Amino acid sequence: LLKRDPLNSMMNIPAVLSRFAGKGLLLSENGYLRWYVASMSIGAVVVLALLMVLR
């Protein structure tokens, strides 16, 4: 049962989590300028709303 080193896979779980998160986050870099402007406006809305909530 232990010949496949289960604790090694348990600590390799963060590696596959990082790989999956990077692959998911790379979908935002679609290369479209209109999406880049939309993301800038989204960040502006998020920053302004966070500043108004925490004030």
Partner 1 sequence: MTITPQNLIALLPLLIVGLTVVVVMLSIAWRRNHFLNATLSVIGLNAALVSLWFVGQAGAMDVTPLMRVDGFAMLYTGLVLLASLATCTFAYPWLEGYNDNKDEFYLLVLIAALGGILLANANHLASLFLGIELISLPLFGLVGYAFRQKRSLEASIKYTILSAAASSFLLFGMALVYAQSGDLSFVALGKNLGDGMLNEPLLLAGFGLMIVGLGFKLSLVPFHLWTPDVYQGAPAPVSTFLATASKIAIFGVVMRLFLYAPVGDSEAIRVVLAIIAFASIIFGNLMALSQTNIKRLLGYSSISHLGYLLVALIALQTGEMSMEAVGVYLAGYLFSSLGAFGVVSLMSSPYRSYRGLFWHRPILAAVMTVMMLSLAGIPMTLGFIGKFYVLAVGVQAHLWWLVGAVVVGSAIGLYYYLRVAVSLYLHAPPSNWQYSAGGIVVLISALLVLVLGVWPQPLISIVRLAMPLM
Partner 2 sequence: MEFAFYICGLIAILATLRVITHTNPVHALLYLIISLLAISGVFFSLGAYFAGALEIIVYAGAIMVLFVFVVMMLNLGGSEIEQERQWLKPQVWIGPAILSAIMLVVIVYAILGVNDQGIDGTPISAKAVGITLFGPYVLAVELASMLLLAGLVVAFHVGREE
Partner 3 sequence: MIPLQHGLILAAILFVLGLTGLVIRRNLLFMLIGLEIMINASALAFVVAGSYWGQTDGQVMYILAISLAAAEASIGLALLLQLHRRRQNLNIDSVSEMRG
Q: Which residues bind partner 2 (CB under 8 A)?
A: 38, 41-42, 44-45, 48-49, 52
Radius of gyration of the chain (CA): 19
CA-to-CA distance for 24 and 12, rounded, in angstroms? 19
CA-to-CA distance for 2 and 16, rounded, in angstroms? 21
> If contact means CB under 5 to 8 A according to the sort of partner, which of partner 1, partner 3, ligand LFA, none does residue 6 touch?
none
Which residues of this chain interact with partner 1, rule CB under 8 A?
18-19, 21-23, 25-26, 28-29, 31, 33, 35-37, 39-40, 42-44, 46-48, 50-52, 54-55
CA-to-CA distance for 3 and 16, rounded, in angstroms? 21
Which residues of this chain interact with partner 3, rule CB under 8 A?
26, 29-34, 37-38, 41
